[PDB]
Write an enzyme that holds these catalytic residues in place. Structure first.
Site, mmCIF file in Angstrom:
data_model
loop_
_atom_site.group_PDB
_atom_site.id
_atom_site.type_symbol
_atom_site.label_atom_id
_atom_site.label_comp_id
_atom_site.label_asym_id
_atom_site.label_seq_id
_atom_site.Cartn_x
_atom_site.Cartn_y
_atom_site.Cartn_z
ATOM 1 N N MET A 179 0.821 -1.202 0.000
ATOM 2 C CA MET A 179 0.000 0.000 0.000
ATOM 3 C C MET A 179 0.861 1.260 0.000
ATOM 4 O O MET A 179 0.419 2.331 0.429
ATOM 5 C CB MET A 179 -0.910 0.005 1.233
ATOM 6 C CG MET A 179 -1.868 -1.169 1.261
ATOM 7 S SD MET A 179 -3.194 -0.949 0.030
ATOM 8 C CE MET A 179 -4.638 -1.258 1.065
ATOM 9 N N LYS A 191 6.961 3.615 -7.603
ATOM 10 C CA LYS A 191 7.277 4.786 -6.792
ATOM 11 C C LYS A 191 7.234 6.034 -7.661
ATOM 12 O O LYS A 191 7.302 5.957 -8.892
ATOM 13 C CB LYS A 191 8.639 4.625 -6.094
ATOM 14 C CG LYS A 191 8.732 3.527 -5.030
ATOM 15 C CD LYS A 191 8.030 3.841 -3.714
ATOM 16 C CE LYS A 191 7.995 2.703 -2.723
ATOM 17 N NZ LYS A 191 7.055 1.656 -3.160
#
Ligand SMILES: [Ca+2]
Ligand SMILES: [Ca+2]
Lengths: 124, 124
Positions: free
Chosen positions: A44, A82
């Protein structure tokens, strides 16, 4: 269609046949830019931009990333999703979840490969 | 395929041809339960569960709803995506975003049609 990638072998291209878990019938041009594969997201770390554990990231292949872009990155042999931020010879791989620290990469000591650019998500 | 649906016309079914923009080639059974259509979400009312403005909601057609399900609802001729909550003759359609107050429906006064259950998302 689009291949679904679940595991990523060390020292092999991400799109290698041996990485393909299955196939999705969605056309690549559904996405813009065009998608090359779907990658299963784990955890998450990106929940605050609505990317959740188990989502499939639609990925457009590219080896260069720009500040602010959501990218797939291989740091060493680990694949992560990311947000990209480059500080000269430093790269930050920023999470979108205050519970996860930015991952610092020194481009001098650690190998970093950008595997591509996020162009969408499929959640099921 | 799966029809992609933007704005929804009054007094016509959501799957009416006049509502369909294009078809996605994804298999309906990519989702479980199986999707019947993709509906474009507007605004940020559902952001807290990772459903964002512009997302295509994968919808399984059903006419009944259980408390806490994320549903497509039509009140009059306005379609919305919200969490369902009923007590007796009253229904609250709840947002997943603190800035949005409940939409309350009196089932003795107003017709409420459930158009389906959320089974997934495509973001592009
Ligand atoms: Ca290597
Ligand atoms: Ca769309």
């Amino acid at each position: 269609g689009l291949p679904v990638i679940g595991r990523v072998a060390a020292d092999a291209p991400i799109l290698a046949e041996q990485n393909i878990e299955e196939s999705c019938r969605i056309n690549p041009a559904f996405f813009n830019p065009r998608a090359d594969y779907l990658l299963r997201v784990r955890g998450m770390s990106m929940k605050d931009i609505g990317i959740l554990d188990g989502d499939l990231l639609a990925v457009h292949v590219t080896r260069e990333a720009r500040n602010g872009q959501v990218v797939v990155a291989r740091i060493g042999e680990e694949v992560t999703v990311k947000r990209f931020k480059r500080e000269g010879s430093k790269v930050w791989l920023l999470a979108e979840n205050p519970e996860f620290a930015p991952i610092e990469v020194d481009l001098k000591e650690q190998e970093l490969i950008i595997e591509g650019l996020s162009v969408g998500v499929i959640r099921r």
